[PDB]
Structure formats: C-alpha cells, structure tokens
C-alpha cells in the first residue's frame, strides 16, 4: 500500500518545475548591442567629410536646418535616397558649427595639414564601409528577431505552472484550482486508468500527487512528506475545490526561495524528468504511485494524476500535454536566443575595433 | 516483495535510451561551406588582374586554349607552381574573351579609368589575400574526417539498443532476443548475484527489467506498469526466447512516438541515469529491484538484469558494458563533429562580407 | 518499513557527487591562446623595427643587457612609459644579434632592400595596431579573467565531498568522519525531524544514508544495496565515529573508476538531483527514506540525513547547505569559463590570420 515517502521521486520532478515559476528564472546574459558604436562611427564619417558634403545636408535657406526633402529633392542616379535618413541622423548635430568643431577635437582629427586629413578621411570612409557591411549582414536582424526577454519567459513559465502571468501569493489570491471544474471526488478530479484529470497546469498536478485528504491523512496522504502530513484538510467529497491554504501547504514542499539561471538544457532536463515518469497505459498515462483502478488518494489505489494525451500507443509529453508543451516552448526560445546572442557578438567585437582604430590618429596616418 | 510500480525508476532510465533508437535521433547541425564565396573571390582577383597575367594561363597557340605545363614549363625562378591549379580553375572561364567582359561588367569592374581600375585591382588583391588567409587554417581534412552523418550515428544507436542497424518493426520481425542464447529459466537469462545475463543490448535489458511472465503476472510482473501488466505470457522454462509479440508489449512503455535532438550532453545524461542505478556488488551489478538471489521475476527474488563487467571493485559502465560503450561512442563522435563545425565555418562569415566589399564599386575606389 | 533497496534513488543522486571527486572531473575544453598570439605579433613588430628603435631598449653598458629605467630614465616627453613593459617583453629575446637575425629569417624579413623593408614594416605596424585594438575590447579582458583551471575545480569538488583538497585513500587516512563530532547514537549523528546532522560534507551524508549498522543489517541496512549489506559493523552506541574501513564499504557503491566531463550543466543537474530530493519539513529537511522520528537506521524510523538550513519555509540548498554551496561555486566558475572560451574564439582566430598574413611577403608589399 502507498505510504510515507512513496512519492518523493514524483515530488522532486514536479518541484523542479514549480521552482522555475515566479520571478525566480533569470536570463543572465549580455544583450549584444553595437548600435551606439555604429551610430558613432557614422557620425565620425560625417564629421570628417568635406564641408561640401555636409552642405548637401544643410537647408539651402538656413544653414543650421535639416534639408527639407520637399524643398530640395534628390537627383536621379544619386542613390542618396534611403541613405539620407541615416546620413541626416549623423548630420543633424553637425549642422551646427560649434558642435562640428567639438566633434572634430573629440575624435582627435582637428588641426592637421590637408594631406593628413585627406589621408585620415580616406581610411575612415573605408572603415565606415566595413562597419556598415557587417552591421547590415542579413544574419543580423535574423538573430535580432530570435532575441527574447526575461519577462516574456517568466510569463510563459507562470502560465505553464499556474495558467497565470504571475505566481499567486501564499493565499493563491486570484487563483482557483483545476480551472474551477472539480466535481465529485478525488478520482474524478485527478483521473483514473480510463479518464483524464481536471488539472491543466503543473501546480494542480502537484496537488493531485501530493495533497493529503481527510481519508488518507494517516497513510497515503504522507506520500510526498517525511514525518508530518501536509495537513490540507481537503475533503473533496464535500467541497471539491481546494482552498488557497491547502494549495500552499503543498507548494511549500518546493524550493520557492531561490533562483535558477535560465538555460535551455536546464528546462530540457526538468521536462525530461517529468515526462519519463509517466506510466503509459491503455487509455491514460499516470504520474505518481498507482496500485489499482484510479487516483483516488486511497492507499490501495493511487496518489497520482492521469493524462489522456499520452498512452502506450501515442503521445510525446512535451508536445501533447499542454502545460509541458508551453514549457518546451520556453526551451525553444532560449535556444534561439542563446544562438542569437552568440552570433551578434562577432560584429559587436568588429565594430568596437573599428571605432577604436578610427579614433587613433596614428593608425590613420600610416 | 516486488510489486506494482517498483521499477518506474529503471523503466524511465532504460526508456530514455530506447527513445533514441529508430530514426528518432536527429543531427540538426548545419554542415558549413564557404567554397562558393571563396571561389567567387578568386575569380574576381583574376578578372581584375592585368591581361598579361590572364595571358599567362593560355597556350602560346590558340588564345582560348589553356597552357600545357608539359608544353610550356613553369618558370623555376617563381613560386607559380603551387598556386597554378587554383589560378587556372578560376581563370578557365576567363580564357574565353567574351566571358571576361561579361564577368568584368558583372563585377562592376568593366568600365573606364585605367587608373581607377588599378585602384580596384589593388583592393581586390588585398581582399583576396586576406580571404585565403582567413580560410587557410591547416588543421582541415582531418577536421573534415572528424565529421559524421546522422545516418551513421543512428546505426550505432540501433546497434546499442537492438544489435541491428535498424529498429525492428512492431512485430520485431527478424529480431531474436538475447542473441538467441536464452535457455533454462528467467534467472539464467537475466542473471543473478554471481552471474550475468544473456542480454547484450539495451532492449533485452529492458525486457529483463520489465517483462511479466506466466508466474508473476499478478505481483512482480507489474513492476514497470500502473493499471494492467504487460501481458507477455512469457514462459522461459517451456520456451526461453520470447517472441516479438511479447517484446513489443514491453517496448510500448517507452516513447517511440517523438524525436530527440542529438547532443553529447543528451547522451551523457541518459547514460548516467542508467549507470548510477546499477547497484554494485562483489560479483555483479544489478539494474532493477532486487531482494534475494537472482533476477528470476519472483516477487521475493528480483525483476532485474545483471552484469559482471562492473562491480564494487572494478569497471565504469560507459567503457565496460558493451552496449553502453557503443552509445558512448556516439557521444564521442558527436563532440568531435561539433568541434569541427566551429573550426570549419569561421571563415564563412568573414568570406561573405569580403565579397560584398569587393562587389562594392565605391569600396574599390578609395 | 525501510527495507532492501529503498534508498537506491538517494544513493544514485549522492553517487553522482562522489564520482566527481578525486582527479576524475576533467576540463576537456581547449585552453585559449589569445595573449600568446598577441605576444607573437608584438615580437614580429619589434624585429621589423629599425635598429635604432631596438637600441632604445638596451643600456649603454653591454648591448646584451636590458636598459635599466632608473639608470636611463625614459624621456618625459614621450608616451613610452605607457608601452614599455610590453615593448620590453618583445625586445629582450631580440637583443642578441643571432636571435634577431634568426627571427628576421623566420618572419621572411631578412635580406630585404631598404624600400621593401620599409614597405613591409609599415604594413606590419598596421596589422600590429589592429591586433592591439582587438585586445582592448573589455569583453576580451573580462573573458581572460573568467578562465579557470582543472586543478582549481578539482580541489573545490574534493572540498565539497571530503572537506579536503585530495580524495582520501581506501583507508581514509588523514580523514575523520563527521569532523570528529559524532556522539551518542545514530539519530544524533544523522539528524532527526527536529535536529540537523553532524555531516558537513557529501561523503558523510552518503554514509548516514547508506551505511548499515549492527542492528539493521538484515532490514534497513540494505536500503542502498541488493543482496548483501555493506557490512560496516558500525555501532554508534559504543564507538560513534566510523572507521575508514567502514566509510570505504559505502564509497565502493559509487563509480570511482571512470571520469566525468566537467560542464556547468553537468554540475547543475547533479546538484538539482540532490537538492529536490530533500523532503522539506517545519524544522529540518530529510534526504533518504523516513518513516517516523529520526534517522536512526531503525527500519521503522529512517535511513536518512537531516539538514536544518533548508525547511518548508526557508532555504535553498545550493546557497545554504555549505557543501552544496561549494559545489555550486564550481558550476558558476564553469559558467563564466564556458562563456569566456566562446567569446575568445573569433579574436584568437582573427589574431592567427594576422600572424600568417604578416608572414606572407607578397601581402606585405602590396
Ligand atoms: C611596433 O613598432 C613600432 C616601431 O617600428 C612602434 O612605433 C613606436 O610608436 C611609439 C608610440 O606608440 C613612438 O613613440 C613616439 O616617440 C616620439 C619620439 O620621441 C623621441 O624623440 C623626441 C623628439 O622628437 C625626443 O624628445 C624623445 O626624447 C625621444 O628620443 C615621441 O615624440 C612621441 O611622443 C609624443 O607624442 C605622444 C603621443 O603620441 C605624447 O604622449 C608625447 O608627450 C609626445 O608629445 C610630443 O609631441 C606633441 C605633439 O603631438 C607635443 O604637444 C608635446 O609637447 C611633445 O613634444 C612618441 O612617444 C615611437 O617613436 C615608435 N617607434 C618608432 C617609429 O621607431 C610601435 O609602438 C610598435 N607597436 C606596438 C603596438 O608596440
Ligand atoms: C591575384 O592576382 C594578382 C595579379 O594581378 C596577384 O596578387 C596574384 O597572382 C600572382 O601571385 C603570385 C604569388 O606571389 C605572384 O608570384 C610571384 O611572381 C614574381 C614575378 O614573376 C616572375 O616573372 C618573370 C617570369 O619568370 C620573371 O622574369 C621575373 O623575374 C619574376 O620572377 C616572382 O618573382 C615570385 O617568385 C618568388 O617566389 C618567392 C617569393 O618570395 C621566392 O622564392 C622568390 O622571391 C621568387 O622570386 C612569385 O612567383 C605573381 O607575381 C602574381 N601575379 C602578378 C601578375 O603579380 C593573384 N593571387 C591569387 C592567389 O589569386
Ligand atoms: C561617409 O562619408 C564619405 C564622404 O566623405 C563617403 O564615404 C560617404 O558619403 C557618400 O557616400 C555615397 C555612397 O554611399 C556617395 O553617393 C554616391 O553619389 C553618386 C552621384 O554623385 C552616385 O552615382 C553613387 O551611386 C552614390 O550614391 C556620396 O558621393 C558620398 N559623399 C561624398 C563623396 O561626399 C559616407 N559613407 C557612409 C557609409 O555613410
Ligand atoms: C482505488 O483502489 C482501492 C483498492 O482496490 C479501492 O479501495 C478504492 O475504492 C479505489 O479508489
Ligand atoms: C529468488 O529468491 C526468492 C526468495 O528467496 C526465491 O523464492 C526464488 O525462487 C528465487 O528465484
Ligand atoms: C525511529 O522510529 C521507530 C518507530 O517509531 C522507533 O522504534 C525508533 O526508536 C526510532 O528511532
């Protein structure tokens, strides 16, 4: 008969899921950003150009004024179109003369014989082209699209665990177990060899596997604990829906006091842990200790939860069990993100080196 | 005594191996090539060279004829020997005096200004020399030798699981369990505290751990299931070698319905799960619930499989249990395949940007 | 009642730690070589410098001697104090004329006409300027600072397992169990529901969980094994501290005969396996089978170990159980080291191409 500690293995696997919820999942990565460097290189290119070129960006009416594209349109073969928005962004601070003087000495390029400036201007244009050729590689924006945020991943984890965007408090305010569809008795709520459960998320599955009730409190109700039962007082025959005080007495079995560095292989190992413990039967798969008939909490029956999406003839948990599929989505986004962050580090290092050399007057006069 | 659900741990470990078999293991890595981009750069260098240099790769007779090295030997005062094959290969279309002009304009290099051509040629030159340097990296071919195919890996996995190159069908057609060595009774087949099993692959080990028979169907035969026993009807004392019908009744407990991305970490975890469940003794190591004397399937004996290659005094499974060593070989070959990928595509991104710059007419004119 | 094999799950998780100890944990990742490439480009740049420049790094008394800065202070009208230490590292070998002539030959610079030498020198100084700027990326300096060694992590793992820098021999010489604080009986040594154990490391936690004593050898003392009990002969009511012979009879249950590839994900998984197996109560957390009151080894009580640092209301094992926090440091170091190796890949490959380019005479003369 199912007694004390007989569900420690299933509790450990499920708690590996519950501990990821809340704000406890951390991305802990460096968003690669080379836009400031690029915008500065482009400013250096415009700062070092000939005034004739910058005068193409002034307004014919007023000097320190953006060229009104409606007033002075662009030529035909000019190809200046579409590059104007990037150029004007670099030219807008330099339309003022005082700033242009300031940027000249900031970039350490003011006060040189024309030949020296000619030499520096040529390399900077070449350098600026190399920086643009990398920043505009179609691999970028591809990787940038595959970037996620810590908050988007946290919301998905809390949806897979609680079906909410945030982890409920210790009273589970704004939370109702089993979507409010618990009905008759624990076997109807938690499932059987012929029927699925009413638990759609991870937390309610954990309650089906670990909660004690008024009947098993001295035997099967200690399957996830050691010396003292959870003491939920759950009486599903009378009141089916567990109250928040009961849910918290089961969640406290899981580590809700730490943090986890979000890795894709970390999610994979936790989902694999849960999925491999499902025992595949003719009509359902069972997670937890099961002896006979159903998941009623009876010490001769089972302390478990049942799913109809996975059987000994079909089903992959991370694809067909909804809450597991949601967490597998988080793993997939973590993968795309980790590959994107890595791929965007190469142009970031290149553009930093371009900017560093462009501000070395010695390297420019070689 | 051994009862329902007592081998869920071992079933999860062994099914983590089984699900890797068939064609379910995917090598989703991208085999890199940059030969496309490199060859185009080399053509550009020759398309931009002096016609005296293109005339070097022609026969002294017909202009469209290539130079016969036997007819015209190479100048021994020059290094023109080693690089002659790559030069001609790129030049071979350019020997045609019409393809040259087409390519000359196709690379935005046909035009005017013999001075501005020489400018372009000089930059194409440097870009080419840097491109061949970025890809020259000696340690190649041996790195391409440390490359495998998804098919070769899957054949090794199936050899670890089934001793075959392909997974048997749902009738185990063409499959003989235990290498056709089963005899006497279940303990002789599956081992004991003093002797090993006849099972040399993973599937047959899972059968020893999880099969019910004609005696334990109401007790220990339910060790890996929840509701109903597998139902093999195995009777080794009458017929030792089980049928495919019986074998499939156990394999249906594992997930044969999905896929698994092949990573060396994925193989390592699954091998450690099985390896650390081996209970090390003086003469054998036992996988599965063991109580008394042998792995006979009796509820007072054991539902297990025994190995003599690792004990409490010797042996590491990933090197001394043949089927685990074969699966570890997939892990070693995959960590080499991964390591060679990075060291064969690092030029790929650098070569691609060089082509964009070499095809930019402005970049040629600095 | 606690019987044969009831602690296999706990043995496998704790043996996942013990097997990391000794010199079995391996840092198989390639060790970066970034500074060595940079140091080589610096030495090449010095060989190519004018003899007047190299003469600035010798004192006036014996050319073979390095210039003493106190004897010949650097010109306060130069930035030479900013580059002297690196400059001197490159000059010192070349101070000897043979070593200089040999380097000029190795780098294909010896026997060069003045114009060709100056042309090559200028290109080498441009490549050298690019290599230095690349090393100035803060991510490069951070990555080299985040690189670990295998020996450092091996000492840390052994400190988590044995509280020692080296794994004790098969008689545990120099090792005293429970830091010499065992007393009274097994329940005070291994803990209870109200009190923590005297086990500060992982090896003594494995002993509490798996050691038979002179009273449970036929029942609970087989919780970690199959047929034959460990046979320690432990009698904590007479002599509390177990002898090294007893400790080894438990350690022989783990695989100490192989190796483990070190990785942050591999350490995280092994820690999680132990951390979530801890059954969290109001006053202690228990690892192992538990039925009644304490971890006394009695079949009606428990084969377990107790911690007071984690409860159902507080604590994360990897931060609050000291030996687990030690092992978690290894993971964090492996995290930064793995990111550092990845970030140093492209710049080290980029410096390598600079070295081969600076050793191609054709490229230097373009
Ligand atoms: C690869 O190898 C090359 C050599 O092949 C090597 O190049 C060397 O680069 C360094 C700089 O990194 C050069 O150092 C310069 O040296 C000159 C000359 O100093 C001598 O001559 C002066 C008189 O002209 C004497 O007074 C003096 O005693 C020395 O004998 C210095 O003049 C340079 O310093 C000036 O500029 C610095 C900034 O760049 C200032 O910090 C410094 O205060 C000096 O300022 C002077 O000029 C200012 C105007 O700009 C003026 O305002 C000040 O009042 C002041 O007068 C500088 O130290 C060295 O010459 C190069 N070696 C050569 C060409 O042979 C590379 O370093 C090497 N690569 C790497 C990475 O190691
Ligand atoms: C890309 O195209 C451009 C051409 O526009 C080039 O960059 C390159 O083609 C060729 O690259 C090779 C590799 O360096 C160059 O070879 C060198 O040619 C030198 C001159 O050739 C000889 O010409 C006549 C015929 O014999 C002779 O009278 C001359 O005296 C002269 O020797 C040649 O001197 C040199 O040989 C040297 O080889 C080693 C170099 O250190 C030493 O053993 C020794 O110094 C020896 O002298 C070498 O063979 C070639 O010039 C160049 N083509 C042109 C037109 O410049 C293309 N690159 C790629 C890979 O696509
Ligand atoms: C950086 O600044 C320098 C100028 O000092 C240039 O390298 C470049 O400014 C302009 O670059 C564009 C091309 O990107 C040139 O436009 C060309 O105009 C031609 C007609 O006159 C047309 O036929 C071509 O197709 C181009 O569109 C423009 O001349 C040039 N400005 C000059 C030379 O003053 C800047 N580059 C970047 C990356 O911002
Ligand atoms: C679960 O199975 C037990 C034993 O057959 C039964 O008593 C319960 O009623 C059932 O829910
Ligand atoms: C396994 O051990 C049990 C108990 O001793 C015995 O009854 C069986 O015959 C044996 O195979
Ligand atoms: C552990 O619990 C059992 C059963 O109550 C008791 O007999 C032992 O004395 C205790 O250590």
Residue numbers in the entry:
A (entry chain C), B (entry chain B), C (entry chain A): 24 to 389
According to the publication:
Long-term immune evasion by the African trypanosome is achieved through repetitive cycles of surface protein replacement with antigenically distinct versions of the dense Variant Surface Glycoprotein (VSG) coat. The mature VSG proteins are attached to the cell surface by a GPI-anchor, and consist of two main regions: (1) a large, N-terminal domain (NTD) of roughly 300–400 amino acids that is most distal to the membrane and (2) a smaller, membrane-proximal C-terminal domain (CTD) spanning 80–120 amino acids beneath the NTD that harbors the GPI-anchor. Therefore, at the heart of antigenic variation in the African trypanosome are the NTDs of the VSGs. These large subdomains are elongated folds centered on a three-helix bundle scaffold.
An additional crystal form of VSG11 shows non-crystallographic trimerization in the asymmetric unit, while another form also raises the possibility of an inherent flexibility that could be present in the VSG proteins. In a second crystal form (VSG11N2C-18mer, determined to 2.6 Å resolution), the asymmetric unit contains six trimers of the same arrangement as observed previously for all class B VSGs, for a total of 18 independent molecules (hence “18mer”). Finally, when the different monomers of the 18mer are compared with the other crystal forms described, a wide variety of conformational changes is seen, although these changes are limited to the bottom lobe and lower regions of the bundle. Due to the high flexibility of the bottom lobes in the 18mer crystals, not all amino acids in some monomers of the bottom lobe could be modeled.
